[PDB]
Amino acid sequence: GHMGNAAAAKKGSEQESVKEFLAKAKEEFLKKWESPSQNTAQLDHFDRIKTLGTGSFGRVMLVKHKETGNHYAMKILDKQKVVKLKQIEHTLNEKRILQAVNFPFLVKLEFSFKDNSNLYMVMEYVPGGEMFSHLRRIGRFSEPHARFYAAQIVLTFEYLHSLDLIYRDLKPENLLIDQQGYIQVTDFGFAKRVKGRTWTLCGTPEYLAPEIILSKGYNKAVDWWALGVLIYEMAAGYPPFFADQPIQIYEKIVSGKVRFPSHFSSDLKDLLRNLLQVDLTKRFGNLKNGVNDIKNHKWFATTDWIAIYQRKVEAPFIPKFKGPGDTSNFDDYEEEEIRVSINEKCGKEFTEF
Amino acid sequence: TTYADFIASGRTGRRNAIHD
Ligand SMILES: C[C@H]1CNCCN1S(=O)(=O)c1cccc2cnccc12
Helix, strand or coil, X not given: CCCCHHHHHHHHHHHHHHHHHHHHHHHHHHHHHHCCCCCCCCHHHEEEEEEEEEECCEEEEEEEECCXXXXXXXXXXXXXXXXXXXXXXXXXHHHHHHHHCCCCCECCEEEEEECCCEEEEEEEXXXXXXXXXXXXXXXXXXXXXXXXXXXXXXXXXXXXXXXXXXXXXXXXXXXXXXXXXXXXECCCCCCEECCCCECCCCCCHHHCCHHHHCCCXXXXXXXXXXXXXXXXXXXXXXXXXXXXXXXXXXXXXXXXXXXXXXXXXXXXXXXXXXXXXXXXXXXXXXXXXXXXHHHCCHHHCCCCHHHHHCCCCCCCCCCCCCCCCCCCCCCCCCCCCCCCCCCCCCCHXXXXX | CXXXXXXXXXXXXXXXXXXX
16 A cells, blocks of 8 residues: 555544544634624724725724734724625624634734724734735745645645635735744635535636536535645746636636646646546545545645644745834835714624624 | 746736625
8 A cells, every 4th residue: 555554543643633623623613603702902002004905895004002012904994885895794704703713824813893984803913915926026936835835725724614614715815924934814705604505606716616607506625626726826926727808717717627837746736636626526625535635645745734733844935024013025005094983884784893 | 838828818916806
């Protein structure tokens, strides 16, 4: 066989220990899920420094906590805008997930609160910026470098999927790099807790699984497809399926054909062919052996999964950090005021926040 | 080349989700 007695017993024990870890993690999650924390700070506890990120959601600002001096990333949502964009449920869900999960590669919600006009999620400040920027600058990541990040996503999805959370928003734009070079996952608006199938068309064209494009009911295997896209893009510098317009991208995604740079190792191509598998009955992460087909793949043979989880692996890349509050790994945005009305807006909608 | 095709796609920048 492929393993002698010692290696087989070690692997089996390791896989059993994962089960035990996840069983405890689920119990911890469900307690916080069922009784969420609320209203753990207020706006005047913080000085607003600089906008780090923007979007239809609102903005994320670097803030400094006045008492402690600690920096945080404060996501600010306009309650009236959220309502108008039909994002009430997504916004409530994002905060509910964030305050309930606990994993070393998931960003921590340190405080949350609301006022008459806005919702505030105060997260730890992840100073290295988006993987996207580093990827586009460096061009592509070496396979060891890509693997180090991929291993963190594998473990994070193993954790999330055990909680019946589908993530659905994986892409380099949505992965931040912390001061030790490890990943932080931040955005959970598209995540959904469902045991079975779900049907919403959501995500980013290059990262959509075929069963999403084809308007099928789908399950957590769409996250393993997206992992294949991410690994490919990290190692190539461009994604496996691209075109001028999304419709052309979808045609390629559903076609069942993918092509690889000549510098991809055979192990990497084999992994990617099994993650970027249009046939759900054959896709790694969706088989009887579950996540083990991925973790035990040859491309991950050098990965010490426990050492990754414990953050004892030396990262291949440490972003520049000229001290706390440093924002040099983020873009510059036009700074708007934070208006708080004398009149509460959309109160009932956001009771649970 | 594939790289050139990627540059030509116009989709080298940050990509929005479908709902945006
Ligand atoms: C564009 C938005 C939402 N998508 C993920 C990245 N970000 S963000 O960079 O502002 C961003 C979002 C959430 C937490 C953060 C922590 N530290 C720094 C930045 C953070």
